[PDB]
Amino acid sequence: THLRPYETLGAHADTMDGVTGTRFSVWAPNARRVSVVGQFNYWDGRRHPMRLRKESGIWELFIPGAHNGQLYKYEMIDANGNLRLKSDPYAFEAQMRPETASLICGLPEKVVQTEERKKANQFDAPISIYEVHLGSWRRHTDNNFWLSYRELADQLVPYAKWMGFTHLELLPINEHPFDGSWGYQPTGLYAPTRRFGTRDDFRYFIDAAHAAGLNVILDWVPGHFPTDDFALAEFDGTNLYEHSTLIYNYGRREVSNFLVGNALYWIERFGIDALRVDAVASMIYRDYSRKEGEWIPNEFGGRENLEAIEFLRNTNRILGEQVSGAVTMAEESTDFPGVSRPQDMGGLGFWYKWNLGWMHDTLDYMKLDPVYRQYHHDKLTFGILYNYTENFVLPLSHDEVVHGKKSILDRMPGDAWQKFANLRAYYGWMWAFPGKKLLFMGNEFAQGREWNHDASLDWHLLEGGDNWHHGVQRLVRDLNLTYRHHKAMHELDFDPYGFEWLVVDDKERSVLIFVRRDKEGNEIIVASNFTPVPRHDYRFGINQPGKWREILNTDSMHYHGSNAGNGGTVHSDEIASHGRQHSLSLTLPPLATIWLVREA
Numbered sequence: 114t115h116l117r118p119y120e121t122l123g124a125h126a127d128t129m130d131g132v133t134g135t136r137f138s139v140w141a142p143n144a145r146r147v148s149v150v151g152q153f154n155y156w157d158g159r160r161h162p163m164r165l166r167k168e169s170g171i172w173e174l175f176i177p178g179a180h181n182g183q184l185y186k187y188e189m190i191d192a193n194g195n196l197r198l199k200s201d202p203y204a205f206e207a208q209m210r211p212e213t214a215s216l217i218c219g220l221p222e223k224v225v226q227t228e229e230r231k232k233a234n235q236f237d238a239p240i241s242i243y244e245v246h247l248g249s250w251r252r253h254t255d256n257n258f259w260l261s262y263r264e265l266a267d268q269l270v271p272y273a274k275w276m277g278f279t280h281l282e283l284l285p286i287n288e289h290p291f292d293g294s295w296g297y298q299p300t301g302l303y304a305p306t307r308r309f310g311t312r313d314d315f316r317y318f319i320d321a322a323h324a325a326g327l328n329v330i331l332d333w334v335p336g337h338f339p340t341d342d343f344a345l346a347e348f349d350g351t352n353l354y355e356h357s358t359l360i361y362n363y364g365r366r367e368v369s370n371f372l373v374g375n376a377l378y379w380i381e382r383f384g385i386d387a388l389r390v391d392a393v394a395s396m397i398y399r400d401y402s403r404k405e406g407e408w409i410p411n412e413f414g415g416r417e418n419l420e421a422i423e424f425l426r427n428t429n430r431i432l433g434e435q436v437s438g439a440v441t442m443a444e445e446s447t448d449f450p451g452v453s454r455p456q457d458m459g460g461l462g463f464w465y466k467w468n469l470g471w472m473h474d475t476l477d478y479m480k481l482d483p484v485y486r487q488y489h490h491d492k493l494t495f496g497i498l499y500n501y502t503e504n505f506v507l508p509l510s511h512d513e514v515v516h517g518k519k520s521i522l523d524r525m526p527g528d529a530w531q532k533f534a535n536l537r538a539y540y541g542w543m544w545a546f547p548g549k550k551l552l553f554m555g556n557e558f559a560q561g562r563e564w565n566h567d568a569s570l571d572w573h574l575l576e577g578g579d580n581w582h583h584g585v586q587r588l589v590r591d592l593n594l595t596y597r598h599h600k601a602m603h604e605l606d607f608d609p610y611g612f613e614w615l616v617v618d619d620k621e622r623s624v625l626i627f628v629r630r631d632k633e634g635n636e637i638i639v640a641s642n643f644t645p646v647p648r649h650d651y652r653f654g655i656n657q658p659g660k661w662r663e664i665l666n667t668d669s670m671h672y673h674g675s676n677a678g679n680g681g682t683v684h685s686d687e688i689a690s691h692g693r694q695h696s697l698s699l700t701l702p703p704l705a706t707i708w709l710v711r712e713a
């Protein structure tokens with residue numbers, strides 16, 4: 114019953130005696146005095162000094178005629194007799210950057226999650242995420258002004274839906290004061306940033322996404338305490354939200370009530386269908402060793418923060434009980450055990466983990482010159498080995514395209530034509546490899562310079578006639594749309610059944626072949642030739658003979674590939690290859706991957 118602090122704390126419309134006003138409550142149990150100051154009383158806190166309930170530590174007071182729209186603050190004298198104003202930790206709407214004051218409105222209406230959105234999160238579901246930072250995806254050209262939440266509905270959602278993505282993941286939209294944090298250093302946890310409009314424009318924007326068939330993942334930030342002025346730091350003159358840099362005292366009921374509630378709020382009150390936490394490693398460790406001693410099983414040097422580890426665990430359980438169908442995802446880098454394993458098994462309790470190791474391993478490989486990929490087969494092949502230890506998302510995130518890491522396009526080897534060929538052949542490996550898929554805005558049309566959180570994306574790359582960039586984009590649209598159609602590509606991602614090697618070592622040629630199969634037993638053959646060399650009459654074993662039809666060739670004219678493929682429907686011919694009792698002779702185009710389906 115303390116899992117929706119937001120439903121009662123903060124500032125909410127109420128009616129007393131039949132006189133409309135607004136009701137104010139703030140948790141500040143070591144204050145000597147609290148007052149609401151606002152427009153309604155000309156920022157004079159003498160007028161409306163609040164009332165303390167010693168039992169709970171909450172200050173209360175109802176102001177008549179105070180209506181939503183009007184800015185306010187809490188002016189307290191803290192526990193030590195100092196004087197400061199505080200912004201509402203439960204501000205649902207806030208002034209913009211330097212202004213930093215809370216606007217009064219209430220909760221939006223609860224949003225009920227459809228059976229359709231709930232199926233889209235499930236492990237058997239095709240899950241292709243399109244990751245976006247709203248502040249830098251497009252801009253108005255003349256102004257270089259931000260697209261509003263409302264303009265983002267007009268543009269982003271038709272564009273995400275068009276491209277065939279399944280989900281839409283936004284970098285944090287909690288209110289924060291500086292752009293370059295990207296939103297991962299917040300101030301107002303319950304307020305969507307005013308950059309792009311009002312709280313209800315945000316609503317209108319996710320409602321619009323919903324209506325177009327997209328789920329919305331939201332980067333959630335319980336890991337980074339709010340360091341700035343008016344934040345929570347030393348909230349009532351004591352260390353209230355924080356511990357004696359700065360970490361939340363998660364062990365304290367009201368703080369967990371604050372943060373677990375934040376999750377329910379975003380899910381229940383805006384209809385967000387999934388939350389992700391960046392940098393769990395930061396949250397669950399700390400720089401210094403415990404110093405009480407060594408009561409440490411899973412040796413981590415005793416810098417583990419158990420208090421925080423219980424928090425993630427407890428949050429996942431509550432989110433399971435209370436809002437089933439919404440899910441949570443994590444990115445953790447210390448190889449911590451079982452971030453995506455059930456809490457009961459002792460895991461963190463997250464549903465999917467970002468597969469940072471597979472992204473590191475593949476890009477390195479793809480980085481290399483095609484003439485050396487013979488000596489590094491392991492980076493493609495060892496991926497499957499660890500796959501069944503987590504429920505993985507193949508990332509290609511915003512973090513991999515910034516700060517001196519070249520764009521994903523810049524890492525490819527070739528002379529121009531080569532250079533795009535890798536990408537087209539890469540993506541079609543990625544989409545065929547076990548795991549859900551996440552891709553960051555810009556990668557889809559093979560942008561060339563790094564992402565600039567301070568600028569629109571180089572959309573101009575797609576002005577002009579069909580070119581290399583139109584080809585990466587169109588391929589991706591096909592990868593998705595074919596990915597979504599074939600149960601094989603997504604049903605058994607986490608079952609050893611769903612994947613089987615057909616050619617783990619043909620190392621010299623750098624050729625790799627495997628299949629993905631669903632629960633019925635239908636298979637899809639995928640073939641990648643990671644060397645610029647074309648390959649004809651290539652032969653290898655199959656489990657199922659019959660008619661095989663090329664459903665996607667990475668190399669085709671539309672993607673500005675060679676356009677040279679196998680031709681038409683291929684029929685299996687009995688020859689002995691790899692002891693499978695059936696073999697195929699195929700064209701392995703140059704720097705391209707191939708996908709085959711078997712015609713009945």
Ligand SMILES: OC[C@H]1O[C@H](O[C@H]2[C@H](O)[C@@H](O)[C@@H](O[C@H]3[C@H](O)[C@@H](O)[C@@H](O[C@H]4[C@H](O)[C@@H](O)[C@@H](O[C@H]5[C@H](O)[C@@H](O)[C@@H](O)O[C@@H]5CO)O[C@@H]4CO)O[C@@H]3CO)O[C@@H]2CO)[C@H](O)[C@@H](O)[C@@H]1O
Binds near residue numbers: 568
């Ligand atoms: O050499 C001269 C000059 O060059 C440089 O200035 C360039 C900027 O540095 C550079 O950023 C680029 O600015 C880009 C911008 O970064 C990028 O986001 C992109 O803008 C897109 C919009 O996002 C997109 O919407 C579309 O705009 C639409 C709009 O959505 C729609 O509502 C309607 O208004 O139609 C618009 C199109 O007309 O497309 C644009 C671009 O295609 O592109 C920007 C480029 O304009 O380019 C600047 C020009 O050089 C150097 O920085 C400077 O030192 C040099 O003096």
Ligand SMILES: OC[C@H]1O[C@H](O[C@H]2[C@H](O)[C@@H](O)[C@@H](O[C@H]3[C@H](O)[C@@H](O)[C@@H](O[C@H]4[C@H](O)[C@@H](O)[C@@H](O[C@H]5[C@H](O)[C@@H](O)[C@@H](O)O[C@@H]5CO)O[C@@H]4CO)O[C@@H]3CO)O[C@@H]2CO)[C@H](O)[C@@H](O)[C@@H]1O
Binds near residue numbers: 591663669
């Ligand atoms: O231009 C826009 C285009 O959009 C739509 O076409 C898309 C298709 O709907 C979609 O299936 C996909 O087409 C793929 C195709 O699936 C894939 O097999 C591959 O086609 C290869 C052949 O496999 C290969 O044999 C070779 O064709 C040879 C042929 O064998 C030979 O007998 C002789 O005819 O020479 C041919 C040379 O082309 O190469 C082709 C490559 O085209 O790649 C296709 C393109 O990706 O994607 C299509 C484009 O998005 C609409 O259906 C269509 O009306 C529109 O024109």
Ligand SMILES: OC[C@H]1O[C@H](O[C@H]2[C@H](O)[C@@H](O)[C@@H](O[C@H]3[C@H](O)[C@@H](O)[C@@H](O)O[C@@H]3CO)O[C@@H]2CO)[C@H](O)[C@@H](O)[C@@H]1O
Binds near residue numbers: 156184
């Ligand atoms: O429309 C009048 C005025 O609006 C804006 O100024 C207001 C601020 O936006 C608002 O935050 C508030 O400022 C208070 C601070 O938050 C608080 O820390 C302390 O300094 O008390 C202030 C109020 O005295 O109120 C002001 C206006 O009173 C806008 O920025 C102005 O351009 C505009 O003139």
Ligand SMILES: OC[C@H]1O[C@H](O[C@H]2[C@H](O)[C@@H](O)[C@@H](O)O[C@@H]2CO)[C@H](O)[C@@H](O)[C@@H]1O
Binds near residue numbers: 271
């Ligand atoms: O033609 C390139 C074009 O593709 C997409 O435009 C879509 C549009 O989003 C849909 O609403 C519908 O009209 O189909 C169009 C393509 O046929 C992209 O949205 C757009 O950026 C791009 O220029």
Ligand SMILES: OC[C@H]1O[C@H](O)[C@H](O)[C@@H](O)[C@@H]1O
Binds near residue numbers: 290291292293
């Ligand atoms: O000056 C560079 C940038 O610094 C910070 O990101 C500020 O929030 C932003 O307003 C400014 O443009």
Ligand SMILES: OC[C@H]1O[C@H](O)[C@H](O)[C@@H](O)[C@@H]1O
Binds near residue numbers: 522562
């Ligand atoms: O720096 C950006 C450039 O990187 C590489 O040169 C790409 O080939 C080119 O397309 C892109 O414009």
Ligand SMILES: OC[C@H]1O[C@H](O)[C@H](O)[C@@H](O)[C@@H]1O
Binds near residue numbers: 531647703
């Ligand atoms: O498949 C033919 C290809 O051979 C090589 O990759 C060339 O670099 C490229 O220009 C050509 O298109």
